[PDB]
A paper describes a structure:
The HIV-1 envelope glycoprotein composed of the receptor binding subunit gp120 and the fusion protein gp41 is the prime target for neutralizing antibodies. Receptor binding induces a conformational change in gp41 that transiently exposes the conserved heptad repeat 1 (HR1) region. The fusion-intermediate conformation of gp41 is an attractive target for neutralizing antibodies due to its relative high sequence conservation. We previously reported the isolation of the gp41-specific antibody HK20 from immortalized memory B cells of an HIV-1 infected individual, which targets the conserved hydrophobic pocket in gp41 HR1.
Here we present the crystal structure of the HK20 Fab in complex with gp41 5-Helix as well as a detailed characterization of HK20 neutralizing properties. The structure reveals that HK20 occupies a conserved hydrophobic pocket within the HR1 triple stranded coiled coil, indicating that HK20 binding inhibits membrane fusion by interfering with HR2 refolding into the six helix bundle post fusion conformation. Thus the HK20 interaction blocks entry by preventing the folding of HR2 onto HR1 which is required to catalyze fusion of viral and cellular membranes in order to establish infection. CDR H2 and H3 loops contribute the main interactions in both cases whereas Phe 54 at the tip of CDR H2 points into a hydrophobic pocket that is occupied by gp41 HR2 residues in the post fusion conformation. While HK20 CDR H2 contacts two HR1 helices, its CDR H3 contacts only one HR1 helix. In contrast HK20 does not bind directly to HR2 and HK20 CDR L3 contributes only two hydrophobic contacts (Leu 94 and Asp 93). Interestingly, the crystal structure reveals that HK20 and D5 Fabs approach the same HR1 epitope with different angles; while D5 binds almost orthogonal towards HR1, HK20 contacts 5-Helix in a ∼60° angle. Our HK20-gp41 structure demonstrates that His 564 is important to coordinate CDR H3 HR1 interaction, which can explain the poor neutralization of JR-FL. Shuffling of Ig chains showed that mutations in the heavy but not in the light chain contributed to the increased binding affinity, a finding that is consistent with the structural data, which reveal only a minor role of CDR L3 for HR1 recognition. The fact that HK20 Fab and scFv efficiently neutralize all pseudoviruses tested indicates that the HR1 epitope is easily accessible for proteins of 50 kDa or less and that in the intact IgG the presence of the Fc and/or the second Fab arm obstructs epitope access.
Numbering used by the authors:
A (entry chain H): 3 to 52, 52A, 53 to 82, 82A, 82B, 82C, 83 to 100, 100A, ...
B (entry chain L): 1 to 95, 95A, 96 to 214
C (entry chain A): 543 to 584, 1626 to 1664, 2541 to 2581, 3624 to 3664, 4543 to 4582
Amino acid sequence: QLVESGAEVKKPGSSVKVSCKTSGGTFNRLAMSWVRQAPGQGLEWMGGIMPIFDITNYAQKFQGRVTIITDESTSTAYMELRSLTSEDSAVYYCARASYSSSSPYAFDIWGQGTMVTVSSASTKGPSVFPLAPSSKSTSGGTAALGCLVKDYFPEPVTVSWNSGALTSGVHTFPAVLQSSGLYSLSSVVTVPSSSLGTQTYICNVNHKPSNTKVDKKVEPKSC
Amino acid sequence: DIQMTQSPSSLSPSVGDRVTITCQASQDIRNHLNWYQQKPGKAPKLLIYDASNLATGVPSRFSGSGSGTDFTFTISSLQPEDLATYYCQHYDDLPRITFGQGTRLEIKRTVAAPSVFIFPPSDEQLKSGTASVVCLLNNFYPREAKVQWKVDNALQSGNSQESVTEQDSKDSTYSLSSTLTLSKADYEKHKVYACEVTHQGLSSPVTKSFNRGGC
Amino acid sequence: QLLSGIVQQQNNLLRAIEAQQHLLQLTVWGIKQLQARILAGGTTWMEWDREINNYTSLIHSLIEESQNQQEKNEQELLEGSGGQLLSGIVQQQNNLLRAIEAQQHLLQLTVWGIKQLQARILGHTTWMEWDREINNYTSLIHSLIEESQNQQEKNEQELLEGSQLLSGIVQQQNNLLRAIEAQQHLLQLTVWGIKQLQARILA
């Protein structure tokens, strides 16, 4: 079962290391690979490992910049890419090979992906403003409420509601590139207008690249 | 070496339609093809392995075919949650791994008028010297829509940004969010803030607005 | 509670066959990679490949069939056992034996593949000892399979009459267990051969 490290910013000449933790614990019984997705565009296999035979494979285009490592003691796998180019901005995935396939390349278990941006520009923390209801946010009798995540670099941010306990009827919009160079994003949710007095709504914004975590309670307008 | 070409690049099927996708290989690759399904913001999911095998737990509507250079992926009847980008992947033991370009899906569904909502700037945001007004369009189809920002119902402005959501998994709808951003200085000069939405599912354009504030 | 111990032991044997299949598949993946690397550069590997697929397909079918029998037995046992439980236990021993036989065919194909790769790549001392060990276990596994087949037939006949049966089932549990343990040794021998071939390729 696979879990990856948080999104990162890296300076052009840098190298990035991405980790991938398995729940099982032993690499000596599996094959796994690293695949990236650079919009734009499409999926690219970077390399693979069969640690039991001490086999490590690297794609020709990445040979000389890529290292794949396993650590039995932490049951964590690592890929490191060096000499980062503006062409290496991508989401990186570790994935496990299915045992059903005649080769170790039918990837059936995947990590959540790690976004790496190659910039040179400094990280910026997001500011989180409520989107309060509102006369004026109804249909009804349903109310729309939300959070505005403004002024952050680079992507991405995560938004959840009530620490995961609210999943029904959320829309988290794609970011837009402001003329500043910073990103803006909004996340809105539809609720009963009936229960606005008794229920509590908190958006949870997480910006891993600058290590920011903001919890914002949304409530009607005050005067 | 080796070259994989996927066809077509996009499709607009209706819920309940059979959809077929094609990958061609430049050289003979026997049964070394896998198919994946990637929902937006999610990792890919194995659907078919070794050309024609259902990955365990994958619904029975998914199937694959082909042997040498010609391969076919088929969804017998599309369901709304099947909305995704679909990829073929060639594999070789040397190893060589090659993914196709992908086929995007756009589900066709019945026209639906957006619910329109509007949000005045927050008191917290104004303190820092900038004003963001947000106009929200919820659950609409087709994706095409126009948002008109009127300030004092006299002039359409030109200083905003919008983004469209990915098509919805459950009901196949889109959502748009436009943001008007001005500053505290320009926001308190004018009175009325209106968002005029011009969608196909609306007879006449709909308008949503508020008034404020002081200081 | 002997019957309940039998069903849970068949579950352990099933899990062992599954993990053994995983490792066996991994060896196939190792051999295909070394084969592709010596090929280019620089086949009746085509018929090997065909034979690999035939047995890989069979073992997959037998595993799933065993998983389904295992759930049935665990259900029957939860409903109060045995009449149909007994026949399902004998059937589950039939499934496990066939899965062991298919895996054995797979094991002998990988031994062949490794020997083909060895002849091309090649020190000489540890390989001759490997060879003797491979021969001993293959030979051991056959007579263990034969002993299981003979006990299965005898168990099946006795089942069709009444019930000695229960002792035959227990003897068959041990027969199957020993076959799997001898195969796990054979499979460690093949892992070692692949690892060694990989190490020699880089020197």
